[PDB]
Design an enzyme around this catalytic site. Structure first.
Site, short mmCIF file in Angstrom:
data_model
loop_
_atom_site.label_atom_id
_atom_site.label_comp_id
_atom_site.label_asym_id
_atom_site.label_seq_id
_atom_site.Cartn_x
_atom_site.Cartn_y
_atom_site.Cartn_z
CD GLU A 11 -3.10 -1.16 0.24
OE1 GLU A 11 -3.31 -0.04 -0.38
OE2 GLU A 11 -3.88 -2.06 0.18
CG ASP A 20 -8.25 3.81 -4.09
OD1 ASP A 20 -8.85 4.29 -5.12
OD2 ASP A 20 -8.81 3.02 -3.42
CG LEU A 32 -12.21 4.02 1.01
CD1 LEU A 32 -11.84 4.60 -0.33
CD2 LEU A 32 -13.27 2.98 0.81
CG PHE A 104 -5.74 -4.10 4.29
CD1 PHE A 104 -5.39 -3.15 3.32
CD2 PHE A 104 -5.64 -3.72 5.63
CE1 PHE A 104 -4.94 -1.87 3.68
CE2 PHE A 104 -5.19 -2.45 6.01
CZ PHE A 104 -4.84 -1.51 5.03
CG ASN A 132 -10.49 -19.63 -9.38
OD1 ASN A 132 -10.86 -18.74 -8.60
ND2 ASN A 132 -11.37 -20.30 -10.17
#
Ligand SMILES: [Cl-]
Ligand SMILES: [Cl-]
Length: 162
Positions: A11, A20, A32, A104, A132
Site C-alpha cells: 500500500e 487510490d 479508504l 484488507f 483461479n
C-alpha cells in the site's frame, strides 16, 4: 516479514489525502476514506477518524494507528465470516497473511466471493488456487500486487516480497 510489513509494501504510506487506484480518497497505508468524489467529504471523514481538525494531512503516528485498526479489523472480519474462517484456520502462517492482504484490500464480502479459489486453498491445491485467482478483475486491475499475493499462496514463502 509479517502482515504489517507486507501491507506497508503493497500500500505505501501517504500522509496527505490521495486517490487510490480506483480514484477514491484514501490516506495513510491504504486507508479508504470515502467513495464520494468530494474532497470535503473525504476531509470530514478523515477528521472523524482521527479525532481532530486535520486539514487533510496526518502524521505518521496517526497513519500507523489507522493501519493497526485496519489490520485488526480485516482479521476480525475473516474470523467472523462463515466462509473465510475455515479457510484461514486451515492455512499456515504465511498463507494466512496472504488472505488478510486480500481482505484488507477488497473487503471480506469481495473475497468470500472467490468460491472456487477458497475451496482450492482449503484443499491445499496451490496451483489450482493460483490459476483461479488470476482470472479476476482484481488481477487485471492491479496485476503486480495480485501476482505478489498469488505467489505467496502458491509457495507458502515470502519470496515475492524479498
Ligand atoms: Cl476509521
Ligand atoms: Cl499492482
Amino acid at each position: 516479514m509479517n502482515i504489517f510489513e507486507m501491507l506497508r509494501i503493497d500500500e505505501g504510506l501517504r500522509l496527505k489525502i490521495y486517490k487510490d487506484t480506483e480514484g477514491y480518497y484514501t490516506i495513510g497505508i491504504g486507508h479508504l476514506l470515502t467513495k464520494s468524489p468530494s474532497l470535503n467529504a473525504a476531509k470530514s471523514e478523515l477528521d472523524k477518524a482521527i479525532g481532530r481538525n486535520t486539514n487533510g494531512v496526518i502524521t505518521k503516528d496517526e497513519a500507523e494507528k489507522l493501519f493497526n485498526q485496519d489490520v485488526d479489523a480485516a482479521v476480525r472480519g475473516i474470523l467472523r465470516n462463515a466462509k473465510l474462517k475455515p479457510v484461514y484456520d486451515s492455512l499456515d502462517a504465511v498463507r494466512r497473511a496472504a488472505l488478510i492482504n486480500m481482505v484488507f484490500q477488497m473487503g471480506e464480502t469481495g473475497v468470500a466471493g472467490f468460491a472456487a479459489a477458497l475451496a482450492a486453498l482449503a484443499a491445499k491445491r496451490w496451483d489450482e488456487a493460483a490459476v483461479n485467482l488470476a482470472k479476476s478483475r482484481w488481477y487485471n486491475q492491479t496485476p503486480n500486487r495480485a501476482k505478489r499475493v498469488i505467489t505467496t499462496f502458491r509457495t507458502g514463502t515470502w519470496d515475492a516480497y524479498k
